[PDB]
Amino acid sequence: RKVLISDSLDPCCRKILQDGGLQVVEKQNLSKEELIAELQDCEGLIVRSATKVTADVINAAEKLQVVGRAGTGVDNVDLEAATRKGILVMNTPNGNSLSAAELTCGMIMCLARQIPQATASMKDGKWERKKFMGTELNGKTLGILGLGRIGREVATRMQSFGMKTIGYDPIISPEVSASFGVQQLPLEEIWPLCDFITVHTPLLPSTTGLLNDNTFAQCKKGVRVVNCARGGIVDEGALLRALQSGQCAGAALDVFTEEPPRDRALVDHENVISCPHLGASTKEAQSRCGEEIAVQFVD
Amino acid sequence: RKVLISDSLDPCCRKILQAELQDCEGLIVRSATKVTADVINAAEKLQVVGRAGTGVDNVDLEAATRKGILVMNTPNGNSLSAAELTCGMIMCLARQIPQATASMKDGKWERKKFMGTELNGKTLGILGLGRIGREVATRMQSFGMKTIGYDPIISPEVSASFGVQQLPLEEIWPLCDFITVHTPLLPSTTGLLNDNTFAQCKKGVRVVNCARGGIVDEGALLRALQSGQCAGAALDVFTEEPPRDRALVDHENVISCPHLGASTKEAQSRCGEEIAVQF
Ligand SMILES: NC(=O)C1=CN([C@@H]2O[C@H](COP(=O)(O)OP(=O)(O)OC[C@H]3O[C@@H](n4cnc5c(N)ncnc54)[C@H](O)[C@@H]3O)[C@@H](O)[C@H]2O)C=CC1
Ligand SMILES: NC(=O)C1=CN([C@@H]2O[C@H](COP(=O)(O)OP(=O)(O)OC[C@H]3O[C@@H](n4cnc5c(N)ncnc54)[C@H](O)[C@@H]3O)[C@@H](O)[C@H]2O)C=CC1
Known part of the structure; x- marks a missing residue:
């Protein structure tokens, strides 16, 4: 009442x-x-x-x-x-799915072209064209882990960029994902194919550290990773090690295992772009x- | 030889x-x-x-x-990359990702400040519907943006084939949530966006220039930003490169790159x- x-x-x-x-x-x-x-x-x-x-x-x-x-x-x-x-x-499970999908797509673009870093450079008075040579998305492979509300919306948008969209989801059938243009493969086959990887799962035992030292080792040298889902799906220590070695070329994080994160190593990394949990904002x-x-x- | x-x-x-x-x-x-x-x-x-x-x-x-x-x-060689950066700037304007990254790196956690805009259902005006303009259109259409536009030599039939409704410029300004320019730099396109055209826009319009510096009058842009008539701008290009006047680059609602469109x-x-x- x-x-x-x-x-x-x-x-x-x-x-x-x-x-x-x-x-x-x-x-x-x-x-x-x-x-x-x-x-x-x-x-x-x-x-x-x-x-x-x-x-x-x-x-x-x-x-x-x-x-x-x-x-x-x-x-x-x-x-x-x-x-x-x-x-x-x-x-409200459906209310903010689109905004999260849109932010994810923006993150992918920001990683490809280093826009946050380029703006930072410009505001620091610099004109650094060579430093920010970027990547064209057309023809690149995007791996999407989690093909529920947000994963499928991310897929159809990045498909308009000519990205190949592959992925994995334990309850979505290969036939169903094909209907929104996502080719499903076993996880093991996904890592070496991806130029970009984005996660859209809940946080569960099976998804905590879905990306870890071992899966990063199976990835393309220079893979770029996005987490606009829940902190911890991408193992934060493993991500840092991959960024430091160069196995990961960049990461975009909207979410963290602790919010706000007390550990600043990832946020402070030059190849990491971040938001204070703005996916639904x-x-x-x-x-x-x-x-x-x-x-x-x-x- | x-x-x-x-x-x-x-x-x-x-x-x-x-x-x-x-x-x-x-x-x-x-x-x-x-x-x-x-x-x-x-x-x-x-x-x-x-x-x-x-x-x-x-x-x-x-x-x-x-x-x-x-x-x-090589007129087609870097068209896609320019269109892709333009779309990324559009996303960046809607959600202020570069500013949020800068904030995070300063140790801040500023959730309220960076409340943003959903693209779905918003109108994008595209001025210049040649190689790059039409590629921006089909991509932003996948986000559910309405794409309208104007080009003096592109027929309504051709723009219709990539989903862009052409209108006279005077009809475009009040409709747009976002405006992006993809023209050459000509006398007719110099200050294509200026004080007179900003005055005709929706309050809070967001503007992208990944084409040539000067197409958006920089003095007019700064005034629109100062009043709130323009809510944000993303600039890859400047009337002087590198720009000696830092007012636009230094504005909190301005996102910029050092001319990376083909990079x-x-x-x-x-x-x-x-x-x-x-x-
Ligand atoms: N950053 C933000 O502000 C926002 C974050 N989220 C979060 O994004 C994530 C996705 O949200 P929705 O798409 O709406 O949820 P959803 O429930 O519609 O889809 C999630 C999918 O993840 C699948 N999945 C479960 N375990 C998996 C595994 N090991 N590997 C691959 N897929 C697995 C599930 O089968 C399910 O299909 C959630 O964590 C949600 O809380 C949602 C909206 C805003
Ligand atoms: N930021 C960067 O690094 C790059 C910038 N560019 C620039 O982008 C711009 C567009 O390139 P493209 O699409 O390949 O050229 P395009 O020649 O294919 O199309 C340009 C269109 O602008 C039209 N136009 C001319 N005056 C107009 C006016 N007042 N109003 C509306 N439309 C008008 C023309 O009719 C033409 O169709 C050029 O300035 C190009 O130099 C191109 C590649 C990357």
Whole structure:
């Protein structure tokens, strides 16, 4: 009957919740005391990733019935604690897929042509044409690991650049991926073929360190790698070693095993381009997720 | 019988053929070397000047013609690389990747600052629908951008075949979320984007120039950026190269490269081979 919105959400979320007949209260960046106190009269909580929904937070809100996440995953929500109290947890798995796919494509282009580094050079007063000789994407092979919502959207865009798109996904059949132009091969056959590799899987035991010292050793010398999925899918130590040896020519990272990352070695590397987890950070994605979660609450 | 190579060319160019111009019948350049009237006249034996690239703006065509010197180029050799950089600038403007990288490298984690724009459903205006313009169009169409444009010699039927609706310029400006230019530099295209045309644009338009410096009036661009009329610009090219005025490059909403549009191993290989073969 009453819902708190604790993070930075599009105005449409509050609006929809009230059309359904609910009261709202949208205080951002609250403290553990100033949140749980504002959770006392609310049956619903809505967050992005800023508000941390620990067991201690969940247990304190006696009236809490539902936690809604405006995004994919449940990383900032204790799914175990919630279930132990009969609290429903909902998210918005489709709301920001396009924005993540678009950012991934931008990362690929930035790696091919070193645009972030070139801008940095220009702003440092330099004119360094030879240093930034880049790579044409036409005819190059892009490997896509994870062919769900985002992987297939990345594929069709990079196909317009004349990239060959190959990939792997344990639940997508070769016939199905072919229908959006991705040729599936066993992982072992993928590494030596790729000029670029991008990952679009959840973080699981099978995907933690999907790229590691061993798979980097099976890659083309000079492969470039993108992670706009979850930190840890690409083993960060292995990536660094590959960058340092030159086996990896560059990497683009939107996500990290720790956010913000305390370890600065990858971010500081001259061949690494990075963003502070911006994959879902468009006005449009935020509008869509804001609505998607409100709709789920109204029901 | 003898050929000089004066700029930075792929190794294949010298191999294939098999001041310091006094004994040469052939000269090969990119855009760095200025082949002015004064230069052509000194080289009595010069028969052909080959440009490993698209423009011949750096070659005095009048001087060459007055001495019977053939001037050749490689008009298709680096078109793809230019179109690919243009698309990358477009993505960079929408999501501010270069700025976010700079931020991260300063130890910052600035999520709110770099809230961006989704390309899907946005309108891209493409001025110049020749070799590069049409390649930018089909790529950005895969992102779900509406592509409109203008070109005085390209028919509506031809642009329709690569999905670009042509309109008069005056109708283009208010429609565009992004504008990219792919024309030569001519009096008619100098300041194609200027104060008068920025005034007709959507507030917050984003602009790309990977063509020639001056097509976007740099003084006008800075004013549009200062007001917010232009939300961002990506520049590969400048009216002076390297530019001595740093105001645009130094602007936080400006992304830039030192004229890298043709600077891929593949483009240079193609232009290098193509011009050598012609010799
Ligand atoms: N950087 C950001 O801001 C954003 C990150 N994401 C994340 O991107 C990733 C992909 O998201 P979606 O495509 O919507 O998820 P999805 O669930 O639609 O697709 C994920 C695919 O990964 C497959 N997969 C699982 N294990 C695999 C393995 N060992 N190898 C290859 N594929 C495997 C799954 O079968 C599934 O098809 C997720 O981690 C998501 O949380 C999503 C949106 C924004
Ligand atoms: N940034 C870089 O390193 C590179 C820059 N370029 C430059 O890109 C530009 C386009 O190259 P291409 O597409 O291969 O040339 P193109 O000759 O194939 O097409 C140029 C088009 O611009 C049209 N045009 C002329 N005036 C116009 C006007 N007022 N408004 C609209 N259209 C007009 C022409 O009708 C022509 O169709 C040239 O300036 C070229 O020198 C080319 C390759 C890489």
